[PDB]
Amino acid sequence: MRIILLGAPGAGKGTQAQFIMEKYGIPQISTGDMLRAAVKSGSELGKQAKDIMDAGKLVTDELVIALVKERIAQEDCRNGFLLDGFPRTIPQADAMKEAGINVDYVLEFDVPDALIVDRIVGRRVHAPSGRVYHVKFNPPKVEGKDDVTGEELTTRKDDQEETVRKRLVEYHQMTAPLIGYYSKEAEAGNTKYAKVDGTKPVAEVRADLEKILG
Ligand SMILES: Nc1ncnc2c1ncn2[C@@H]1O[C@H](COP(=O)(O)OP(=O)(O)OP(=O)(O)OP(=O)(O)OP(=O)(O)OC[C@H]2O[C@@H](n3cnc4c(N)ncnc43)[C@H](O)[C@@H]2O)[C@@H](O)[C@H]1O
Protein backbone atom coordinates (compact mmCIF):
# COMPACT_ATOMS: atom_id res chain seq x y z
CA MET A 1 0.00 0.00 0.00
CA ARG A 2 1.38 3.39 -1.06
CA ILE A 3 -0.37 6.59 0.01
CA ILE A 4 0.28 10.32 -0.42
CA LEU A 5 -1.08 12.81 2.12
CA LEU A 6 -1.80 16.27 0.67
CA GLY A 7 -2.80 19.43 2.48
CA ALA A 8 -1.87 22.87 3.70
CA PRO A 9 0.45 23.31 6.69
CA GLY A 10 -1.29 22.27 9.88
CA ALA A 11 -4.07 20.39 8.09
CA GLY A 12 -3.56 17.26 10.22
CA LYS A 13 -1.52 15.01 7.90
CA GLY A 14 1.10 13.89 10.43
CA THR A 15 -1.54 13.28 13.10
CA GLN A 16 -3.45 10.85 10.89
CA ALA A 17 -0.27 9.26 9.52
CA GLN A 18 0.21 7.42 12.80
CA PHE A 19 -3.13 5.64 12.45
CA ILE A 20 -2.55 4.70 8.76
CA MET A 21 0.92 3.32 9.59
CA GLU A 22 -0.57 0.84 12.14
CA LYS A 23 -3.43 -0.19 9.78
CA TYR A 24 -1.18 -1.31 6.86
CA GLY A 25 2.04 -1.92 8.84
CA ILE A 26 3.90 0.55 6.57
CA PRO A 27 6.50 3.19 7.54
CA GLN A 28 5.92 7.01 7.38
CA ILE A 29 8.23 8.97 4.99
CA SER A 30 7.96 12.48 6.48
CA THR A 31 10.26 14.92 4.69
CA GLY A 32 9.80 17.51 7.43
CA ASP A 33 10.81 15.00 10.09
CA MET A 34 13.79 13.84 8.02
CA LEU A 35 15.04 17.36 7.26
CA ARG A 36 14.78 18.39 10.92
CA ALA A 37 16.66 15.23 11.90
CA ALA A 38 19.41 15.90 9.36
CA VAL A 39 19.86 19.39 10.82
CA LYS A 40 19.97 18.08 14.39
CA SER A 41 22.54 15.38 13.56
CA GLY A 42 24.50 17.48 11.08
CA SER A 43 24.05 14.90 8.34
CA GLU A 44 25.65 15.99 5.07
CA LEU A 45 22.44 15.02 3.23
CA GLY A 46 19.91 17.50 4.56
CA LYS A 47 21.59 19.81 7.07
CA GLN A 48 21.43 22.46 4.33
CA ALA A 49 17.74 22.88 5.17
CA LYS A 50 18.33 24.75 8.45
CA ASP A 51 18.22 28.33 7.14
CA ILE A 52 15.53 27.51 4.57
CA MET A 53 13.09 26.01 7.07
CA ASP A 54 13.72 28.90 9.47
CA ALA A 55 12.63 31.32 6.72
CA GLY A 56 9.48 29.34 5.93
CA LYS A 57 10.65 28.50 2.39
CA LEU A 58 10.76 25.17 0.60
CA VAL A 59 13.96 23.14 0.42
CA THR A 60 15.25 22.51 -3.09
CA ASP A 61 13.49 19.74 -5.01
CA GLU A 62 16.88 18.16 -5.75
CA LEU A 63 17.77 17.81 -2.07
CA VAL A 64 14.45 16.36 -0.87
CA ILE A 65 14.18 14.00 -3.86
CA ALA A 66 17.55 12.49 -2.92
CA LEU A 67 16.48 12.15 0.73
CA VAL A 68 13.33 10.27 -0.25
CA LYS A 69 15.07 8.04 -2.80
CA GLU A 70 17.55 6.94 -0.13
CA ARG A 71 14.76 6.33 2.36
CA ILE A 72 12.38 4.31 0.18
CA ALA A 73 15.20 2.07 -1.07
CA GLN A 74 15.46 0.43 2.35
CA GLU A 75 13.96 -2.91 3.27
CA ASP A 76 11.10 -1.59 5.41
CA CYS A 77 9.52 0.16 2.40
CA ARG A 78 9.43 -2.97 0.22
CA ASN A 79 5.71 -3.59 0.85
CA GLY A 80 4.53 0.03 0.86
CA PHE A 81 4.97 3.34 2.59
CA LEU A 82 3.14 6.54 3.49
CA LEU A 83 4.38 9.78 1.92
CA ASP A 84 3.77 12.65 4.37
CA GLY A 85 4.97 16.03 3.09
CA PHE A 86 6.30 14.66 -0.22
CA PRO A 87 5.73 15.46 -3.03
CA ARG A 88 5.49 19.18 -2.27
CA THR A 89 5.96 20.57 -5.80
CA ILE A 90 5.16 19.47 -9.33
CA PRO A 91 8.82 18.63 -10.10
CA GLN A 92 8.85 16.39 -7.02
CA ALA A 93 5.71 14.64 -8.26
CA ASP A 94 7.21 14.31 -11.75
CA ALA A 95 10.38 12.84 -10.24
CA MET A 96 8.27 10.14 -8.59
CA LYS A 97 6.62 9.26 -11.89
CA GLU A 98 9.93 9.28 -13.80
CA ALA A 99 11.24 6.91 -11.09
CA GLY A 100 8.21 4.62 -11.38
CA ILE A 101 6.75 5.33 -7.93
CA ASN A 102 3.01 4.97 -8.43
CA VAL A 103 0.69 5.17 -5.43
CA ASP A 104 -2.66 3.63 -4.54
CA TYR A 105 -4.33 6.57 -2.75
CA VAL A 106 -3.89 10.35 -2.65
CA LEU A 107 -5.71 11.84 0.36
CA GLU A 108 -6.30 15.61 0.49
CA PHE A 109 -6.77 17.19 3.94
CA ASP A 110 -8.79 20.39 3.53
CA VAL A 111 -8.53 23.11 6.18
CA PRO A 112 -9.29 26.83 5.70
CA ASP A 113 -6.35 29.23 5.77
CA ALA A 114 -7.87 31.02 8.77
CA LEU A 115 -7.48 28.00 11.09
CA ILE A 116 -3.82 27.28 10.37
CA VAL A 117 -1.99 29.66 12.70
CA ASP A 118 -4.05 28.52 15.72
CA ARG A 119 -3.14 24.89 15.00
CA ILE A 120 0.56 25.57 14.78
CA VAL A 121 0.89 27.88 17.80
CA GLY A 122 -0.36 25.00 19.96
CA ARG A 123 1.71 22.31 18.26
CA ARG A 124 4.21 20.37 20.38
CA VAL A 125 6.36 17.52 19.06
CA HIS A 126 8.43 14.55 20.16
CA ALA A 127 11.28 14.81 17.67
CA PRO A 128 12.80 11.30 18.11
CA SER A 129 9.55 9.63 16.97
CA GLY A 130 7.73 12.32 14.99
CA ARG A 131 4.66 12.19 17.25
CA VAL A 132 2.65 15.42 17.21
CA TYR A 133 0.38 16.93 19.87
CA HIS A 134 -1.68 20.09 20.40
CA VAL A 135 -1.97 21.66 23.84
CA LYS A 136 -5.73 22.23 23.35
CA PHE A 137 -7.01 20.12 20.45
CA ASN A 138 -5.01 16.90 20.98
CA PRO A 139 -3.04 17.15 24.22
CA PRO A 140 -0.62 14.59 25.64
CA LYS A 141 -1.85 12.34 28.41
CA VAL A 142 0.65 14.06 30.74
CA GLU A 143 1.16 17.78 30.20
CA GLY A 144 4.35 18.47 28.28
CA LYS A 145 5.41 14.81 27.99
CA ASP A 146 5.46 12.27 25.18
CA ASP A 147 2.90 9.52 25.78
CA VAL A 148 5.33 6.71 24.90
CA THR A 149 8.74 7.79 26.24
CA GLY A 150 7.78 10.41 28.84
CA GLU A 151 10.29 12.85 27.35
CA GLU A 152 9.62 16.58 27.46
CA LEU A 153 7.93 17.82 24.29
CA THR A 154 9.39 20.69 22.28
CA THR A 155 8.16 23.48 20.02
CA ARG A 156 9.47 23.40 16.45
CA LYS A 157 11.68 26.38 15.68
CA ASP A 158 9.68 27.17 12.53
CA ASP A 159 6.33 27.06 14.39
CA GLN A 160 6.08 30.83 14.79
CA GLU A 161 3.16 32.89 13.49
CA GLU A 162 5.19 34.83 10.91
CA THR A 163 6.93 31.69 9.62
CA VAL A 164 3.64 29.83 9.24
CA ARG A 165 2.24 32.71 7.17
CA LYS A 166 5.20 32.39 4.80
CA ARG A 167 4.72 28.62 4.65
CA LEU A 168 1.10 29.20 3.64
CA VAL A 169 2.15 31.49 0.79
CA GLU A 170 4.61 28.86 -0.44
CA TYR A 171 1.90 26.20 -0.17
CA HIS A 172 -0.52 28.10 -2.40
CA GLN A 173 2.26 29.05 -4.86
CA MET A 174 3.93 25.65 -5.33
CA THR A 175 2.06 22.86 -3.52
CA ALA A 176 -1.68 23.43 -3.94
CA PRO A 177 -1.33 22.66 -7.69
CA LEU A 178 -0.75 19.03 -6.68
CA ILE A 179 -4.48 18.75 -5.98
CA GLY A 180 -5.19 19.20 -9.68
CA TYR A 181 -2.15 17.12 -10.63
CA TYR A 182 -3.31 14.04 -8.72
CA SER A 183 -6.99 14.63 -9.45
CA LYS A 184 -6.13 14.20 -13.13
CA GLU A 185 -4.05 11.12 -12.36
CA ALA A 186 -7.16 9.65 -10.74
CA GLU A 187 -9.30 10.72 -13.71
CA ALA A 188 -6.88 8.71 -15.87
CA GLY A 189 -7.19 5.70 -13.56
CA ASN A 190 -3.62 5.86 -12.24
CA THR A 191 -4.53 6.32 -8.56
CA LYS A 192 -7.46 6.85 -6.20
CA TYR A 193 -8.17 10.39 -4.96
CA ALA A 194 -10.23 11.43 -1.95
CA LYS A 195 -10.72 14.67 -0.03
CA VAL A 196 -11.54 14.90 3.67
CA ASP A 197 -12.76 17.76 5.86
CA GLY A 198 -9.83 18.43 8.19
CA THR A 199 -11.81 20.75 10.47
CA LYS A 200 -13.55 17.80 12.13
CA PRO A 201 -12.16 16.38 15.39
CA VAL A 202 -9.18 14.05 15.10
CA ALA A 203 -11.23 10.92 15.77
CA GLU A 204 -13.79 11.85 13.10
CA VAL A 205 -11.13 12.50 10.47
CA ARG A 206 -9.67 9.10 11.35
CA ALA A 207 -13.07 7.47 10.83
CA ASP A 208 -13.56 9.26 7.51
CA LEU A 209 -10.18 7.95 6.35
CA GLU A 210 -11.18 4.46 7.50
CA LYS A 211 -14.24 4.53 5.24
CA ILE A 212 -12.20 5.68 2.24
CA LEU A 213 -9.49 3.05 2.76
CA GLY A 214 -11.65 0.12 3.92
N1 LIG B 1 8.90 17.94 0.32
C1 LIG B 1 9.49 19.07 0.71
N2 LIG B 1 10.02 19.89 -0.19
C2 LIG B 1 10.61 21.03 0.24
N3 LIG B 1 10.71 21.41 1.49
C3 LIG B 1 10.19 20.59 2.43
C4 LIG B 1 9.57 19.41 2.04
N4 LIG B 1 9.14 18.80 3.15
C5 LIG B 1 9.48 19.57 4.19
N5 LIG B 1 10.11 20.67 3.76
C6 LIG B 1 10.64 21.74 4.59
O1 LIG B 1 10.20 21.55 5.92
C7 LIG B 1 9.49 22.74 6.36
C8 LIG B 1 8.32 22.32 7.29
O2 LIG B 1 7.54 21.34 6.60
P1 LIG B 1 6.52 20.47 7.44
O3 LIG B 1 7.26 19.56 8.34
O4 LIG B 1 5.63 19.66 6.46
O5 LIG B 1 5.60 21.50 8.33
P2 LIG B 1 4.28 22.37 7.99
O6 LIG B 1 4.40 23.00 6.69
O7 LIG B 1 4.06 23.45 9.08
O8 LIG B 1 2.99 21.31 7.96
P3 LIG B 1 2.85 19.80 8.59
O9 LIG B 1 2.77 18.77 7.44
O10 LIG B 1 3.98 19.48 9.52
O11 LIG B 1 1.41 19.75 9.37
P4 LIG B 1 0.28 18.57 9.28
O12 LIG B 1 -0.53 18.70 8.06
O13 LIG B 1 1.01 17.21 9.31
O14 LIG B 1 -0.66 18.72 10.59
P5 LIG B 1 -0.43 18.22 12.11
O15 LIG B 1 -0.74 16.72 12.20
O16 LIG B 1 1.02 18.52 12.55
O17 LIG B 1 -1.45 19.05 12.99
C9 LIG B 1 -1.22 20.39 13.15
C10 LIG B 1 -1.58 20.79 14.58
O18 LIG B 1 -3.01 20.73 14.75
C11 LIG B 1 -3.35 19.63 15.58
N6 LIG B 1 -4.43 18.90 14.91
C12 LIG B 1 -4.21 17.88 14.08
N7 LIG B 1 -5.41 17.43 13.61
C13 LIG B 1 -6.37 18.19 14.16
C14 LIG B 1 -7.77 18.21 14.06
N8 LIG B 1 -8.48 17.36 13.31
N9 LIG B 1 -8.48 19.10 14.74
C15 LIG B 1 -7.82 19.97 15.50
N10 LIG B 1 -6.51 20.03 15.66
C16 LIG B 1 -5.76 19.13 14.98
C17 LIG B 1 -2.12 18.73 15.76
O19 LIG B 1 -2.09 18.18 17.08
C18 LIG B 1 -1.00 19.76 15.60
O20 LIG B 1 -0.71 20.41 16.83
C19 LIG B 1 8.96 23.34 5.08
O21 LIG B 1 8.70 24.73 5.26
C20 LIG B 1 10.16 23.12 4.12
O22 LIG B 1 11.17 24.09 4.39
Could you characterize what this model shows?
- With 214 residues, the protein is α/β, with parallel strands linked by helices.
- It has a single domain, classed as P-loop containing nucleotide triphosphate hydrolases (Rossmann fold, 3-Layer(aba) Sandwich), CATH 3.40.50.
- The protein has nine helices and seven strands.
- It has helices at 13-24, 31-41, 49-54, 61-72, 90-98, 116-121, 161-175, 177-187, 202-213; strands spanning 2-7, 28-30, 81-84, 105-110, 123-126, 131-134, 192-197.
- The strands form two sheets. A five-stranded parallel beta sheet has the order 2-3-1-4-7, sandwiched between helices.
- Strand 5 and strand 6 form a beta hairpin.
- The longest helix has 15 residues, at 161-175.
- The protein is globular and about 45 Å long.
- The relative contact order is 0.19.
- The structure holds BIS(adenosine)-5'-pentaphosphate.
- BIS(adenosine)-5'-pentaphosphate (AP5) is lined by residues 7, 9-15, 31-32, 35, 52-53, 56-59, 64, 85-86, 88, 92, 119-120, 122-123, 132-134, 137-138, 158, 167, 198, 201-202, 205.
- One of its GO terms (biological process) is AMP salvage.
- Catalyzes the reversible transfer of the terminal phosphate group between ATP and AMP. Plays an important role in cellular energy homeostasis and in adenine nucleotide metabolism.
- Residues 122-159 are annotated as: LID.
